[PDB]
């Protein structure tokens, strides 16, 4: 066997979501951006439901649950795209029906952002990131998201500690060849933070330019004060 938290997060994993780009709409930056924002709005619903499965999360105040999700949502979305892309080459699997190559990224105005996502992919391919490690890092990214609005600083530190312990226990059992592998996984979080913050800034600016329709939950998460 292995670590129960890691096993629990694997069973909490949401189902795959299709992008369903509109086949009637001519290809354009607006179409690509609309498709991605619609897909993110849908994935946000299942992320909220997923977070409730994380031990201790639902015991925080609703304010602290909101703060963690408002800080971490884009890291959680990006880590999904990264994980889905590990068996691919220079391509991002937003969804099984929405795989973006460099041309599509350029056409959507996402070349710089998607190149940074591919830098995350490159590092996790070299580390041979496992699904167990991915789900544990998603939960650590939520807990460690550095909201400036936390009420119960100690409870959020205890949630970080619980999930860090789960990663370290997992690695101690599954990866005896590399006693520092848990710390190597923790050392990938700064690039995820950097890429997330760029993506939020990029989509905030698309929101201000007003040419790409966005649904209610996505707009709520974009407008959050961070």
């Amino acid at each position: 066997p292995y670590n129960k938290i890691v096993s629990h997060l694997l069973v909490a994993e949401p189902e795959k979501i299709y992008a369903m780009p509109d086949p009637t709409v001519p290809d354009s930056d607006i179409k690509a951006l609309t498709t991605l924002c619609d897909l993110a709005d849908r994935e946000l619903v299942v992320i909220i439901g997923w977070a409730k499965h994380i031990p201790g999360f639902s015991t925080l105040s609703l304010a602290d649950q909101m703060s963690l999700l408002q800080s971490a949502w884009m890291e959680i979305l990006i880590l999904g795209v990264v994980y889905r892309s590990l068996s691919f080459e220079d391509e991002l699997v937003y969804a099984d029906d929405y795989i973006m190559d460099e041309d599509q990224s350029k056409l959507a105005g996402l070349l710089d952002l998607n190149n940074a996502i591919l830098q995350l992919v490159k590092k996790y391919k070299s580390m041979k990131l496992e699904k167990e490690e991915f789900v544990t890092l998603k939960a650590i990214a939520l807990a460690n998201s550095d909201s400036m609005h936390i009420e119960d600083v100690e409870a959020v530190q205890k949630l970080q500690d619980v999930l860090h312990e789960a990663l370290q226990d997992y690695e101690a059992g599954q990866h005896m060849e590399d006693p520092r592998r848990a710390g190597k996984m923790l050392m990938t979080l700064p690039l995820l933070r950097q890429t997330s913050t760029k993506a939020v800034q990029h989509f905030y600016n698309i929101k201000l330019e007003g040419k790409v329709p966005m649904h209610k939950l996505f707009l709520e998460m974009l407008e959050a004060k961070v």
Binding site: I48, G49, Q65, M66, L217, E220
Partner: peptide
């Protein structure tokens, strides 16, 4: 009022 709060209360 917040959709995020509504979905956390489910």
């Amino acid at each position: 009022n917040s959709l995020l709060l509504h979905l956390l209360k489910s």
